[PDB]
Design a protein around this ligand. Structure first.
Ligand SMILES: Cc1cc2c3c(c1C)C(C)(C)C[C@H]1C[C@@H](c4ccccc4)[C@]4(C(=O)NC(=O)N=C4N2C[C@H](O)[C@H](O)[C@H](O)COP(=O)(O)O)N31
Ligand SMILES: Cc1cc2c3c(c1C)C(C)(C)C[C@H]1C[C@@H](c4ccccc4)[C@]4(C(=O)NC(=O)N=C4N2C[C@H](O)[C@H](O)[C@H](O)COP(=O)(O)O)N31
Ligand SMILES: [K+]
Ligand SMILES: [K+]
Ligand SMILES: [K+]
Ligand SMILES: [K+]
Ligand SMILES: [Mn+2]
Ligand SMILES: [Mn+2]
Lengths: 500, 500
C-alpha cells in the first residue's frame, strides 16, 4: 500500500529516506519517549521509532514520535509532510499547501467499504483491556494525564448521517475505559457534539483511529469547511477512494489499515478532569485542570505490532506548528480569494509560534481597487477573524509582492519596517479569540474574545502608483552583470551545497 | 600599538584571526567593492581588504569593508566587535555592552596631546586634492552620491570649548572640496551645530577622521550623554589616555594614528543635495534627495598606504545593526536602571531590523513595586521614548527573567505568546519618531512624531506572585536525570561542535 495511504508504509518510507531511528532497547513511556522526541523536534533530527516500549503487552504498542516534524536539511525540510501526500521529498511549502487545497473545487470521492483490514488483526473487548495498563506516554512532566491521543483521528457523525468529520483533538486516559479530552468551539467535533446534545437522546457514537493513512491525518488537521466529510476530500486530493472497515460495536467506518482503533461513545452529559497539557504555544500551566469531554471506550482493535504515533508538542518545531499553522494558513488563503481579496499566498511564521499569518498581496490588483489601508485592513480582518479558519490566528500581516511569506526572516523584516505601530493596524476586540494562547487564557483580558489585529505592512504607494523603493541588499542594489561577476570570483578571491 | 587603539593594528588583528580577505587585484569603487562587502555582510564572511582600488593615487586609498560585522561561527560571532575593545574574541554581547557602559561611572581620562603621528605622514592642501578624483565608493546603485563617509568620526566642539563630540553620521561628496551629509535632531552633531548657528558668527570648525582607534569608533556610534566628550569616555573605558594631534588648519585634535583626516568647516548657512542612501532598515527610495548639511574641506592628511573603512549597509547584518542597535540598547539599559526601573538587560533584536529593544525585567523587584502592566508600560515608555537614547527604537518589549534578550528567537517567542495585541500595549504618539524607518518618513503619518509602542510580554502573575508556568521544552518539561540520560545516549541511539 502507498505511503500516503497506509501508516505502516509511511514508517517504511521514513526508514528508506534515512529519516528514522529505530530504538530496540527498552524505553520508558513515562517521559523518556517524549523527551527523546522533544529533543528531535528542537533539533530537526530523524524521527524516533520506539520498538521496545516498557509496558507494551500483546502487541500494544510501539510509538513513532515526530511524524510531521522538520528535517535538518533545507532542501528536504518538509519531507515528512511531503511523505504524507505522495509528493517529492523536496516539495516546497507552496506545493504542499496547494496539494491540501486541491480538493476544494473537486467533486468528493466518497470512501469504499471493504469487509476487513489490518486494523482487525487483533481485538480486545470490554473485559480484556484496561487503558491504565497500556504504555500510554506521559509527554511533559506536569501534564495532568497520560496523553494517549496526540496524533489519531476522532470520527464523529452528525445525527442525520450527512456529515462524518475527521479531526485531531487531544485526549488523555481517565480510567480503565474512559478518556477525557478537549472539545471546544468552533471545532467540528464540538459542533457535532452540540447537535447530539440538542437531540438529547443518546451519547455520540465515536471512534478514534491511530496510525491512519497519512493523507487522512493531514486533512484531520486542516479546517476544511463546515459540513464537509474529510474522507471524500482526501479521496479527491489523492485521486483514490479511501478503503474503510466498519467498527465492530457501532456503524462508523475507520481506515482499513488503521494501527489502533478505539470504539465507543462521546458523552452528551458527563465530563471529567482534563489537562493541563504542554501545548503548541510552548507552555504548560501546572495544576490548571478543567472539566473536559468524556469518552467511553468499549472495544479496541489493532494491527499486529501496532504503532502509535505521538506528538511531543511544545516549543519549535513540531506538528502543532508545521500542520496546525500551515494548514490554517492554506484555508485562510483560499477564504480570502473566495471573498475577492487579492491574496496570493499565506503562511503562519514559525517565529510567531504560528499565531500570525502573513498574507502576500497582489498589489496590481490592490491598486485597481482604489482603496486605503484602513478600509482594506478592516475588510481582510472581518473576513478572516469571523471565520473558523481564522480561529487560531491573532495577527494578520499584509505584505506586498516582493515578500516570500514562507520565509519568516522576510516577514519579520517587512512587519518591522513597513507597519507603523497603531496607525497601520486595526484591532478586533469583538471576534472569537483562541484561549490556548497564554496572553488569552492566562492573560489580562477575556480568554475567548478579542486580542486580534490586522497589521498592514503594505507601503503607501503600493495602494496607488507602485512600489517606490529598492532593497538595500545584494540582490537589488547592484546590476546583474556585477552580481554575477562577484559570484563567479567569490571562491577565487578567498571567501566561502544545496542538498547538504 | 594595540588593536583597539590603532586601526592599522586592528586590520592586522583581523588577518591574524583568519577574518580577513586581502584582494590585491583591481577592484572598482563604483559598486564592486560595496557589492563584495554586501555579500560578506549577508553571509557573515571574512572582512574584505581592497588593496588595489581603481582610482587610488598617491596613497589615497585602500578600503576595508565590514569592519564591525558578524563572523559565521557562533563561538566568535561578535569577534570583530571584541577586537574593537581588547576583549577576547569569544566575548558575549553582554560583555561587549558592559565594556561600552563601564566608563559611565568612571572619571574621564582626558586625551594626551602629542606633536605628531602617522596621520601626518602625507598632506594635501587646498590646491592639491579634488574629492571627485579620489576612489570614493558608490555603495548602492541608486545612491545620490558617492558616500565617502560611512565609518569615520566627525569631530565638532561647542563654541565655549567645553564639549568635544565624536560621532558617526553619513556624508557624500558634493564637489571637489565639499561634502553633504545628515545632521539631524537630536544627534549631538546637530545639537552643536545649533549652538554655532545661534552664535551666528562663523561656520563650525570641523574634522572628519577615518580609520580611528577602534575603541573610539565604538563610542562614536553610542548615544552617551549630552555634554560628554567621547575622548575622555574612551580613555576611561580603555584605561588609557588617547593620543591626539592638532589639525593643521584648525585647533581641533584628531587621533594620532587616524588613517585619513579631513579638516574644514561645517556651514551654519549653506546646504546641498544629500541622499538618497541605502540605509540601515534595508531600503533606498530612489530620487528621494533632500537638502543636507554642507561641509567644506580645506586640507587632507593621511597615513602612508591609508585605509578607508566602509560600511556597505542595508539588510542584515552590518555595522548599522551590530553597533547602532546594540549600543543604543546598552544606553537604554543604563537609563532605565538610573530611573529606578528593574531592567537587567537590553538588546535590539536583529530580526526587528534593530527597531525594537527587548528589556529583561527583574521580576522579584517588579513584584515588590506592586504595580500593573498599564502603569509600568507607561513609566518605561516615558523614560525611554522621551530620551535621545530611545530615538531609533519604536517598540519596547518587556520580558521576564526566563528570556535571554540577546537571543532573538526567544524574544520573538515571548512577544508572540505573552503580549496581547492592543490590551497589553501602550502607544506613544507625542514622542520624537525616527524618520529613517520606512513606515515613518515614507509612511501614512507624521515622519517625525509618534509611531512608538511599549509591548508588555510580562504575564500577569509576574507582577503579583511569580511565574506560574513551565516551558514545554526539553529543558523545562523533563527532570535533570532524564535529560542527562537522553544526552548521554543520544549518539548511541543513532541521532546527531561548539567552536565550528
Ligand atoms: C496537528 C494537531 C492538531 C491539533 C492538536 C494536536 C496536533 C498534533 C495535538 C498534539 C493533539 C495538540 C492540540 C492543540 C489543540 C488546538 C485546539 C484548537 C485549535 C488548535 C489547536 C488541538 C486539540 O487538542 N483540540 C483541537 O480542537 N484541535 C487541536 N488540533 C487542531 C485541529 O486538528 C485543527 O483545528 C482542525 O482544523 C480541526 O478539525 P475540524 O476542522 O474541526 O474538522 N491539538
Ligand atoms: C555605526 C553607524 C552609525 C550611524 C550611521 C552609520 C553607521 C555605520 C552609517 C553607515 C553612516 C549609516 C547611517 C544611519 C544614520 C542614522 C541616523 C540617526 C540615528 C541612527 C542612524 C547615521 C547617520 O548618517 N547620521 C546619524 O545621525 N547617525 C547615524 N549613525 C548613528 C550615530 O552614530 C549614533 O546615533 C550615535 O549615537 C551618534 O553620536 P552622538 O550620540 O550624537 O554623539 N549613520
Ligand atoms: K479536519
Ligand atoms: K503600512
Ligand atoms: K557618540
Ligand atoms: K502581557
Ligand atoms: Mn471538519
Ligand atoms: Mn556624543
Amino acid at each position: 500500500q502507498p505511503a500516503h495511504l497506509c501508516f505502516r508504509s509511511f514508517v517504511e518510507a521514513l526508514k528508506v529516506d534515512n529519516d528514522l531511528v529505530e530504538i530496540n532497547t527498552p524505553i520508558d513511556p513515562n517521559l523518556e519517549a517524549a523527551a527523546i522526541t522533544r529533543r528531535v523536534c528542537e533539533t530537526n533530527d530523524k524521527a524516533p521509532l520506539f520498538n521496545n516500549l516498557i509496558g507494551m503487552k500483546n502487541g500494544l504498542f510501539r510509538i513513532l514520535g515526530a511524524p510531521g516534524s522538520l528535517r535538518k536539511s533545507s532542501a528536504d525540510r518538509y519531507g515528512r509532510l511531503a511523505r504524507h501526500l505522495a509528493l517529492p521529498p523536496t516539495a516546497s511549502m507552496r506545493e504542499i499547501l496547494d496539494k491540501m487545497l486541491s480538493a476544494s473545487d473537486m467533486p468528493p470521492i466518497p470512501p469504499t467499504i471493504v469487509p476487513t483490514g489490518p486494523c482487525k488483526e487483533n481485538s480486545l473487548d470490554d473485559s480484556e483491556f484496561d487503558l491504565t495498563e497500556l504504555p500510554v506516554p506521559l509527554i511533559h512532566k506536569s501534564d495532568g494525564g497520560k496523553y494517549i491521543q496526540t496524533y489519531g483521528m476522532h470520527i464523529v457523525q452528525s445525527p442525520d448521517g450527512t456529515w462524518t468529520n475527521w479531526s485531531i483533538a487531544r485526549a488523555m486516559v481517565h480510567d480503565k475505559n474512559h478518556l477525557t479530552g478537549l472539545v471546544i468551539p468552533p471545532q467540528h467535533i464540538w459542533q457535532i457534539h452540540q447537535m447530539w446534545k440538542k437531540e438529547g437522546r443518546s451519547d455520540v457514537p465515536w471512534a478514534l483511529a491511530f496510525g491512519v493513512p497519512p493523507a487522512a491525518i493531514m486533512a484531520s488537521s486542516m479546517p476544511i469547511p463546515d459540513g464537509v466529510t474529510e474522507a471524500g476530500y482526501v479521496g479527491a486530493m489523492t485521486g483514490s477512494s479511501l478503503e474503510l472497515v466498519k467498527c465492530d460495536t457501532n456503524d462508523l467506518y475507520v481506515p482499513a489499515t488503521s494501527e489502533i482503533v478505539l470504539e465507543g461513545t462521546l458523552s452528551i452529559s458527563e465530563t471529567g478532569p482534563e489537562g493541563p497539557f504542554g501545548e503548541m504555544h510552548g507552555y504548560i500551566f501546572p495544576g490548571d485542570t478543567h472539566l473536559g469531554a468524556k469518552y467511553k471506550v468499549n472495544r479496541i482493535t489493532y494491527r499486529n505490532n501496532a504503532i502509535m504515533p505521538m506528538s511531543s508538542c511544545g516549543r519549535l518545531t513540531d506538528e502543532t506548528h508545521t500542520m496546525i499553522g500551515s494548514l490554517a494558513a492554506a484555508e485562510i488563503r483560499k477564504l480570502c480569494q473566495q471573498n475577492d481579496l487579492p491574496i496570493t499566498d499565506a503562511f503562519a511564521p514559525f517565529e510567531s509560534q504560528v499565531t500570525w499569518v502573513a498574507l502576500r498581496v497582489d498589489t496590481e490588483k490592490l491598486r485597481a481597487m482604489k482603496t486605503t489601508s484602513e478600509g482594506f485592513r478592516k475588510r481582510v480582518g472581518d473576513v478572516v477573524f469571523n471565520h473558523k479558519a481564522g480561529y487560531t490566528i491573532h495577527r494578520l500581516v499584509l505584505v506586498g509582492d516582493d515578500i516570500d511569506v514562507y520565509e519568516g526572516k522576510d516577514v519579520l523584516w517587512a512587519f518591522s519596517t513597513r507597519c507603523r505601530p497603531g496607525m497601520d493596524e486595526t484591532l478586533f476586540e469583538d471576534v472569537r479569540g483562541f484561549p490556548l494562547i497564554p496572553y488569552m487564557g492566562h492573560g489580562n483580558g477575556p480568554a475567548h474574545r478579542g486580542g486580534k489585529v490586522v497589521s498592514d505592512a503594505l507601503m503607501p504607494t503600493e495602494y496607488t502608483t507602485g512600489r517606490n523603493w529598492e532593497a538595500a541588499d545584494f540582490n537589488q542594489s547592484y546590476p546583474e552583470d556585477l552580481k554575477q561577476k562577484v559570484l563567479d570570483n567569490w571562491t577565487k578571491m578567498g571567501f566561502s551545497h544545496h542538498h547538504h
